[PDB]
Amino acid sequence: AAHVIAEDVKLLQFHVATMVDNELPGLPRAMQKSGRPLKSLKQRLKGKEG
Amino acid sequence: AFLFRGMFKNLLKEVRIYAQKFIDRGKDFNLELAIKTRIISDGLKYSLATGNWGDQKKAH
Amino acid sequence: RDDGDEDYYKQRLRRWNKLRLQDKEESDAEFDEGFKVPGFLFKKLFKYQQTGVRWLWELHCQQAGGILGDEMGLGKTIQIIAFLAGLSYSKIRTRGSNYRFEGLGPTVIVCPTTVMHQWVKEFHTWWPPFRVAILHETGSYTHKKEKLIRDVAHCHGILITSYSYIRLMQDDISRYDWHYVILDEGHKIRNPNAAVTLACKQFRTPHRIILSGSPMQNNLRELWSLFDFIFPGKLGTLPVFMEQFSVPITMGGYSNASPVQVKTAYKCACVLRDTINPYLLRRMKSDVKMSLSLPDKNEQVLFCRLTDEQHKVYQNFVDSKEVYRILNGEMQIFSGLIALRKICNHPDLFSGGPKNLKGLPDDELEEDQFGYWKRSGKMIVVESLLKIWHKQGQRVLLFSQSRQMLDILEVFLRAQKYTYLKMDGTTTIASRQPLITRYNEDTSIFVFLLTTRVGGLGVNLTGANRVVIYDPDWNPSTDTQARERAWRIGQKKQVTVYRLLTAGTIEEKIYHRQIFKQFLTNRVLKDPKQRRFFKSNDLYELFTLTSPDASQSTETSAIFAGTGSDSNDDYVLEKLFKKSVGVHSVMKHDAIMDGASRFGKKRNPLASSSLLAKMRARNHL
Amino acid sequence: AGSWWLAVPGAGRFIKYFVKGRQAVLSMVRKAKYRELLLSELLGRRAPVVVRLGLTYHVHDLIGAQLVDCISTTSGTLLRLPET
DNA sequence: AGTTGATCTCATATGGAGAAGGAGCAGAGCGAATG
RNA sequence: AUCGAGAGGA
DNA sequence: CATTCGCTCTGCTCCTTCTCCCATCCTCTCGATGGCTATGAGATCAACT
Ligand SMILES: [Mg+2]
């Protein structure tokens, strides 16, 4: 069904997105089990500790 | 008291969830099996251990 | 040998013609729209096989698939080959479409490797003109297997493949325009999430056929997966099918189901049965006496007691905190069921047995061995069975679900000095058929030791006439397949089958699942009006030890009360009780399995009044 | 993706002039008295600077597209906005 | 040129600061149509 | 060993 | 023919939105994370002859 494949491409887009940037403004955080947020490539590069 | 309210609410929730799938199956349930005493015992223990004052699922 | 080569196929045609010239009358069976079966082939078929060929033609005209669901032994393969021969013979010119064959295009048959050469032999017997080639390491082809598929597509041969090659060669297979896909033993695609299932559904042809003796075995979901191969979209999507049929029909098999649930289930079963009926053709052996007859089967369930130490071990396990973690949802129930089912088989499988010592003299080395028969309540029964049957000169198949228990049984058979053969999934496939023929020929071998799942279909062990199923499986079709090693065409003797169970343990509940599942199957495939037996809460209470005193009924006898289910076999039972072996009770399995006006005055077809009557009767009580 | 129209190079110049001319010439009918204009009077009128493709070309388009109705009269052909 | 056997592998059962976009909207000035 | 938290030093 | 009118096209405010950043180095303790049983089929090619 077209709405299922739309939702699945939307989920693929969300995962490829949160691989690069897990600090998106309008979307949920990608998380491990126990709920901690995943560190993305951007968070690896960004800050004083990056 | 703040912690224990939420933990007792979660316990009543789980007792309802357990018993409903028996009343949906037309037969009485043992409440000694419905009460999952881990909720209070580990909720208070966890929050005192870590100092995260809330649901362990919401630690951040 | 098979026509993967070309000079073999040429030689096989030249030989067939040189034979045919020496025999140098019946008339073709005309159906309709053009289909003909050669008269010499149609005469060779039974009327039920003729009906199957006609049904296959009606499906070919509709361009629908079908499940040829006939019970094992009715000769499904002949019906398929006779139909395909008819298609090739009558040169059916496909209307209005790119498949401008004048005959049969490339066919793929997918089957277990154990039956590939049977298909080749049947084709080379019944319709020699075909070019049948096995895509397998047992196939005759010498070049790379990619080129065989091109050759068999180009010349419109018949490709025979394993399910594993379909799963692995998805592209090189599905690249081509196959005309027919036949799934033999097609219950192998019964899991909709399995990758063999997804690979089989990639075939573009509408002419998809399944051969299976069991369209369903556990769940209505298996039926969905087969119909989603056979007629995509006929049963809708799986989530919808589960909501509309699986839940309503299941929830009205319970004896504690409310009247509304019982009616809703009866309706849903009638709807499903009417939806699948055109596309599932299923004859039973009782429906057609033409294909011989079997001797009588006596199948009984023996309720054994736990030994006192086995009862302690089992009770301590159900009082354990592992079981508390299981019931509190911290653990999956699976490890606990595996443990309970071990304890029921032999406690040493759980406990490791009595503690090992070294330097003991040889006389101590019996009671202290791992798997000693006197610690298992079921082995004390098997001991008395084997002792009576060896004295009667019967021959025994001894099945267990587990191979660990099969080793404990082998150690017992050696210590009792019986002659036996053993087979299991570790027994090399090339050496299996030599063992089965040796057993059938050498009547000096008393026991064949066998896991239930080894060998697939086609293990013909009809040298035996007594069967013990040592422990129950969750899938009912496993234990019916087990007895059908002995009770099958070619059996000359009355087969007695004993199923061992331990009363008030997990084993009695596993048997209750088998019956519940078989009733669920019969409610769709036989008759939706059926009596309701099991309470749901009783069917899923798995971790409670009960064990009846000799004065008490089993739960099975309480459930099936009033059904009538409570000299060699009489003599065996007499000694199983009078010896005080620890048989609590016996039930008859076949008896348990008996679960049973201003308007409309003028026409412009079904009359409204009868369509309305059907709708009302379907929606009222 | 994977599909293309046959096109004419430079069609944008024509399409620009055509779209603006069409709206211009249709407004000449819309703005005239009664929303009526006699075709001979229109074709005699000094075309707007917006009507670069010519005024007859546009009246043939407008009539073919059914954007204006012709009415025959004793005075000759009359353009109208259609009751739509 | 033909034959064996580990081994993998599927599959089964139960704060804040700056920057950027948009809408509102005023009104300049161009060209058609008067009057 | 990692991640997180808290308490400290200049 | 001198308006006059209507219509297109800037460009000037005032939001909403959103993205970025927040001293250096060092020490210690503490909590948490922390992942079936088993039997079958069956394809591979390492490796015997
Ligand atoms: Mg078959």
DSSP string, C125-158: HH-TTS-EEEESTTS---S-HHHHHHHHHHTT-E
User: What residues have CB less than 8 Å from B42, skipping those under 6 apart?
Assistant: B56
Structure-token match 């049973």, residue found: C596
Residue of C373, C382, C387, C404 lying closest to C310 (CA atoms):
C373
Closest CA–CA distance from residue B5 to any residue of chain C (Å): 22
Rounded CA-CA distance C397/C527 in Å is 33
Rounded CA-CA distance C301/C197 in Å is 36
Structure-token match 């009128």, residue found: D45
DSSP string, C457-503: TT---TT--EEEE-S--SSHHHHHHHHTTTSSTT--S-EEEEEEEET
Tokens of B10: 């979660």
Q: Residue C30: enclosing H or E segment and its boundaries?
A: strand C29-30
Residue D80 pairs in a beta bridge with D36, D69
Q: Kindly state the DSSP code that residue A29 receives in the 8-state scheme.
A: P
Inter-chain CB proximity C258 and B26 less than 8 Å = yes
Residue of C618, C614, C507 lying closest to C554 (CA atoms):
C507
DSSP string, D38-56: EHHHHHHS---TT-TT-HH
Confirm if C49 and C78 have CB atoms less than 8 A apart.
Answer: yes
Tokens of C452: 């239930």
Inter-chain CB proximity A36 and B57 less than 8 Å = no
DSSP string, C534-582: --HHHHS--S------TTS--HHHHHTTTSS---HHHHHHHHHHHTT-S
Q: Touch between chain A and chain B (3+ CB pairs, < 8 Å)?
A: yes
Backbone dihedral region of C75: left (phi > 0), alpha (psi from -120 to 50 degrees) or beta?
Answer: left
Rounded CA-CA distance C614/C280 in Å is 23
Number of CB atoms found within 10 A of residue C576's CB? 20
Q: Which residues of C touch B25 (CB under 8 A)?
A: 256, 536-537
**3-class secondary structure per residue, C372-424:** CHHHCHHHHHHHHHHHHHHHHCCCEEEEECCHHHHHHHHHHHHHCCCCEEEEC
Of C256, C327, C536, the CB nearest to B33: C327
Experimental technique behind these coordinates: cryo-EM
The resolution in Å comes to: 1.9
Q: Touch between chain B and chain D (3+ CB pairs, < 8 Å)?
A: no
Residue of C451, C343, C456, C445 lying closest to C395 (CA atoms):
C445
Reading across the β-sheet that carries D69-71, which strands appear in turn? D36-38, D78-80, D69-71
Confirm if C291 and C554 have CB atoms less than 8 A apart.
Answer: no
Residue C30 has φ and ψ, to the nearest 5°, of -70, 125
User: What residues have CB less than 8 Å from D83, skipping those under 6 apart?
Assistant: none
Of C258, C329, C537, the CB nearest to B27: C537
User: What residues have CB less than 8 Å from C13, skipping those under 6 apart?
Assistant: C128, C129
- Give alpha helix (H) positions in C466-531: 476-483, 506-525
Closest CA–CA distance from residue B41 to any residue of chain C (Å): 14
Which CA-bearing residue is nearest the C1' of G23? A48
Rounded CA-CA distance C438/C425 in Å is 18
Alpha carbon distance, N-terminus to C-terminus of chain A: 43
Q: Kindly state the DSSP code that residue C242 receives in the 8-state scheme.
A: I
Which residue type occupies B44? L
Chain A (17-46) residues lying within 8 Å, Cβ to Cβ, of chain B = 35-37
Q: Kindly state the DSSP code that residue A37 receives in the 8-state scheme.
A: B
Rounded CA-CA distance A4/C533 in Å is 41
Which CA-bearing residue is nearest the C1' of G44? C137
Structure-token match 């395909």, residue found: C84
Q: Which residues of C touch B27 (CB under 8 A)?
A: 256, 535, 537
Rounded CA-CA distance C35/C437 in Å is 42
Tokens of C537: 């809460």
Tokens of D18: 């055509």
Contact B38/C at CB under 8 A? yes
Rounded CA-CA distance D31/C64 in Å is 66
Rounded CA-CA distance C402/C149 in Å is 40
Residue D70 pairs in a beta bridge with D79
Q: Which nucleotide is nearest to B45 (CA to C1')?
A: G31
What pairing do the DSSP bridges indicate for beta strands C495-502 and C297-304? parallel
User: What residues have CB less than 8 Å from C364, skipping those under 6 apart?
Assistant: none
Q: How far is the CA of C281 from the C1' of E29 (A)?
A: 85
Residue C424 has φ and ψ, to the nearest 5°, of -155, 180
Angle at C51 between CA C49 and CA C56, to 5 degrees: 95
DSSP string, D61-81: HHHHTTSSEEE--TT--EEE-
Chain C, nearest residue to B22 by Cα: C537
Tokens of C235: 């049963």
Q: CA separation (Å) from C44 to C24, C39, C285?
A: 19, 9, 19
* Burial grade of B26 (CB within 10 A; 0-12, 13-18, 19 or more): middle
Chain C (322-351) residues lying within 8 Å, Cβ to Cβ, of chain B = 327-329
Structure-token match 């298996």, residue found: C222
Mapping DSSP to helix (H, G, I), strand (E, B) and coil, where does residue C516 land?
helix
Q: Residue C110: enclosing H or E segment and its boundaries?
A: strand C107-110
Residue of C410, C421, C418, C422 lying closest to C390 (CA atoms):
C418
Which residue type occupies C388? I
Residue of C544, C289, C503 lying closest to C511 (CA atoms):
C503
Rounded CA-CA distance C420/C396 in Å is 9
Rounded CA-CA distance C342/B43 in Å is 37
Rounded CA-CA distance C486/C464 in Å is 6
Alpha carbon distance, N-terminus to C-terminus of chain C: 61
Alpha carbon distance, N-terminus to C-terminus of chain D: 38
Tokens of C244: 């509309």
Residue of C554, C548, C504, C512 lying closest to C533 (CA atoms):
C512
Confirm if C377 and C304 have CB atoms less than 8 A apart.
Answer: yes
Q: CA separation (Å) from C560 to B9, C142, C475, C523, C554?
A: 44, 61, 21, 18, 10
Tokens of C130: 């075909």
Q: Please state the length of chain C.
A: 621
What pairing do the DSSP bridges indicate for beta strands C466-469 and C447-451? unpaired
Residue numbering of the annotated binding site of C for ATP: 70-77
Ligand 1 centre to CA of C68 (Å) is 11
Inter-chain CB proximity B57 and A35 less than 8 Å = yes
Residue of C190, C142, C184, C177 lying closest to C160 (CA atoms):
C184
Rounded CA-CA distance C617/C611 in Å is 10
